[PDB]
Amino acid sequence: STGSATTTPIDSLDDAYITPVQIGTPAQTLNLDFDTGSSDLWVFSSETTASEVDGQTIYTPSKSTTAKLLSGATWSISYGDGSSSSGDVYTDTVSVGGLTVTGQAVESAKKVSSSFTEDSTIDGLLGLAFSTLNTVSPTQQKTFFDNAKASLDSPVFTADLGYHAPGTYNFGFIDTTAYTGSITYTAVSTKQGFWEWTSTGYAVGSGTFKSTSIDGIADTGTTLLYLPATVVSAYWAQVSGAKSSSSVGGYVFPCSATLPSFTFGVGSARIVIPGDYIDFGPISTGSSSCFGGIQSSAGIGINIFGDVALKAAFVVFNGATTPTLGFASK
């Protein structure tokens, strides 16, 4: 079997991407943020604290003939940005673009932090990292991908994110019409539960490529590209007037600038991120200071190949017994 669903940016900056997911019987369609950096499928629901719901579509397990309470199970998660959510768990039928998993753990939110409440477009998250990161206690649960894997034609999913445009998540197959050239595959470490790999280097604009190992994760659930301070300083030093601002929380640059591209290595292959992908617009409405799409990973403890990097490529998340990541230009 296979699945194919369209993913759409939530706003004019590609702050996050939402993909429709059918849950329960009859179907309840929720727009979830597919996140390769976490492993919990959680939704806003009829159990979410009323004051923490602002325009989201909620899952109501009582209206689903296939919903079953996963007795005694709870979940609690905190993300890298400081956001968090927690609640209880149901099992129900979940379909993504025609691909169905029966008995999938659907984590119902009882509480969500302010960032989730304020994002009216995001009805929940669908985790796609390794199931070892799942927060369900006392019985850890599998991701939608882990549960579907044995039914898939190929044990893979692909992310093809758009730049200010819709894109696609495919499960179980590689769409050979969605990329140019060949897909370069690279080794993955599952030791920290992420799609963790090692980039072979970088170039800034038309500069010479620097061969250097950069360990990091392929994370669809992170907006920006977070790399070592040395790399990030080298990039921003090419933009007149750019600087790191502690009051803003990162590198900013004059909105009047035309940004250089950023190239990252995948083995002997190269993925070029166009300069326009690195512009996140004014820091505040009407400001002439713009926020950079390449930021330092210094306070994080891990480099993150977020949407800024992933949307420049067709990306294969290969969940075979030896997991790998594939990158192709498009």
Ligand SMILES: NCc1ccc(C(F)(F)F)cc1
């Ligand atoms: N990295 C996971 C994640 C996804 C979305 C959000 C936000 F912005 F919607 F709250 C925060 C964190």
